[PDB]
């Protein structure tokens, strides 16, 4: 009886195995746009993905992860609210059963169809496992998805999903360029938070872009054909793999833009 997204193992149950679920800096949150304060001290975000070497894609039973070789300083996030440099290790998405839900963060209570998370670890801690034990260990770049025009840079990901339908399936996935998943603007909100899945560690500086990307209905429909279950088990479609908004508690959300 491991954690997941169902009636009996979903987000409202997580606190029993992971009591930090009721902690002081949990994610996601609702972004109240009128309460977020413009901070003129915030720097432009620096996203340097030109040398990102994607390696593989994996169905872990919760989402699919596109993994990167993080053994050299290649794909890095810096600037913005961050001190130092953070190395890309993987990205994944959260999405809904319907276009009206799926995002983890919300904007004035609006839910987007999906949310992309590009996960980066602080190089000062040497590896990802050590970084998640630190309050400034990770920087997650969150990008909303809305349904409209196709995102051409997403299609390579969509087209490999048939080969990783079920939990524990993986495939080679080299040469994928994550720059094709970014919106035009790097305007953002930022706040201190947590992983949004168990173990829910309070190690993340969140950077949520204001501008969503558009994906087509066909693209998101292919996400929804994935399975939570393993091969040869009863089919449970991989949908609604999002944690709802958690209490803001004693936090301020800062805006990079006026
Ligand atoms: N949705 S999110 O971007 O907040 C984080 C996604 C998964 C975080 C990665 C880890 B899993 B396994 B161990 B557990 B703990 B260590 B290992 B993988 B990393 C972290 B957790
Ligand atoms: Na609100
Ligand atoms: Zn995530």
Q: Report the strand count.
A: 15
Q: Helix count, per DSSP?
A: 4
- Helix fraction, binned, reads under 10%
Beta-strand portion reads: 25-35%
Run of helices and strands: HEEEEEEEEEHEHEEEEHE
Bound molecules: Carborane closo-pentyl-sulfonamide, sodium ion, zinc ion
The N- to C-terminal Cα distance equals: 47 Å
Which class of secondary structure composition applies to the elements? mainly beta
Which assembly state applies to the chains in this document? Answer: monomer
Work out the radius of gyration.
Answer: 17 Å
Q: Largest sheet, described in full?
A: 13 strands, mixed
What's the number of domains?
Answer: 1
General shape: globular
PDB class: lyase
Keywords: carbonic anhydrase, CA inhibitor, lyase
Assembly: monomeric
Entry title: Carborane closo-pentyl-sulfonamide in complex with CA II
List its traits.
binds sodium ion; membrane; Carbonic anhydrase 2; 258 residues; binds Carborane closo-pentyl-sulfonamide; 13-stranded mixed sheet; two-stranded parallel ribbon; 29% strand; binds zinc ion
């Amino acid at each position: 009886h491991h954690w997941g997204y169902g009636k009996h193992n979903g987000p409202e149950h997580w606190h029993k195995d992971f009591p930090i679920a009721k902690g002081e800096r949990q994610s996601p949150v609702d972004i109240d746009t009128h309460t977020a304060k413009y901070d003129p001290s915030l720097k432009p975000l620096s996203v340097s993905y030109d040398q990102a070497t994607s390696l593989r894609i994996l169905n872990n039973g919760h989402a699919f992860n596109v993994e990167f070789d993080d053994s050299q300083d290649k794909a890095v996030l810096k600037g913005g609210p961050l001190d130092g440099t953070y190395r890309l290790i993987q990205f994944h998405f959260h999405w809904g059963s319907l276009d009206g839900q799926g995002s983890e963060h919300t904007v004035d209570k609006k839910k987007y169809a999906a949310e992309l998370h590009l996960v980066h670890w602080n190089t000062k801690y040497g590896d990802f496992g050590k970084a998640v034990q630190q309050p400034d260990g990770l920087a997650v770049l969150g990008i909303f998805l809305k349904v409209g025009s196709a995102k051409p840079g997403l299609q390579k990901v969509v087209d490999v999903l048939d080969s990783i339908k079920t939990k524990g399936k993986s495939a080679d996935f080299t040469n994928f360029d994550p720059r094709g998943l970014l919106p035009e603007s790097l305007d953002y909100w930022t706040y201190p938070g947590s992983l949004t899945t168990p173990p829910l560690l309070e190690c993340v500086t969140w950077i949520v872009l204001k501008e969503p990307i558009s994906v087509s209905s066909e693209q998101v429909l292919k996400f929804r054909k994935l399975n939570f279950n393993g091969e040869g088990e009863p089919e449970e479609l991989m949908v609604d793999n999002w944690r709802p908004a958690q209490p803001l508690k004693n936090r301020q959300i800062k805006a990079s833009f006026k």
